[PDB]
């Protein structure tokens, strides 16, 4: 009966693997808007 | 005289929309 209270009121190891994957997938998309030393980030502009 | 702003002089940096995105 106390497990149920302590949880109903701790899953950080499961939350961290979700967070890490999302933080990496966002960094991947946010790189589609860097120049890396070009005139723009859009191929329809070059 | 001089006075103190508190949180004043914020403008929308441009067009574009946005929902709940800490920009």
């Amino acid at each position: 009966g106390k497990i149920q209270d302590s949880l109903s009121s701790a899953l950080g190891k499961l939350q961290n693997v979700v967070n890490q994957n999302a933080q990496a997938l966002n960094t991947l998309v946010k790189q589609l808007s860097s120049n890396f030393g070009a005139i723009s980030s859009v191929l329809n502009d070059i | 005289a001089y006075t103190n702003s508190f949180t004043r002089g914020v403008y929308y940096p441009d067009k574009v929309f946005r929902s709940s995105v800490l920009h």
Binding site: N26, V29, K30, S33, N44 | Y12, K15, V16, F17, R18, S19, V21
Partner: protein, 49 residues
């Protein structure tokens, strides 16, 4: 499609997002265009991929 400069591809759909009278377009986290406003009729349209 091309909306006065915005060049893209996708399905266009009627929106329901109240684009404040002064907001040209919709910005999505990770920064991809996902809504536009039609210049002539001034209605918001979502741009699904």
């Amino acid at each position: 499609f091309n909306f006065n400069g915005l060049t893209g591809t996708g399905v266009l759909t009627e929106s329901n997002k109240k684009f404040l009278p002064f907001q040209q377009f919709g910005r999505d986290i990770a920064d991809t265009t996902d809504a536009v406003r039609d210049p002539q009729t001034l209605e918001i349209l979502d741009i699904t991929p």
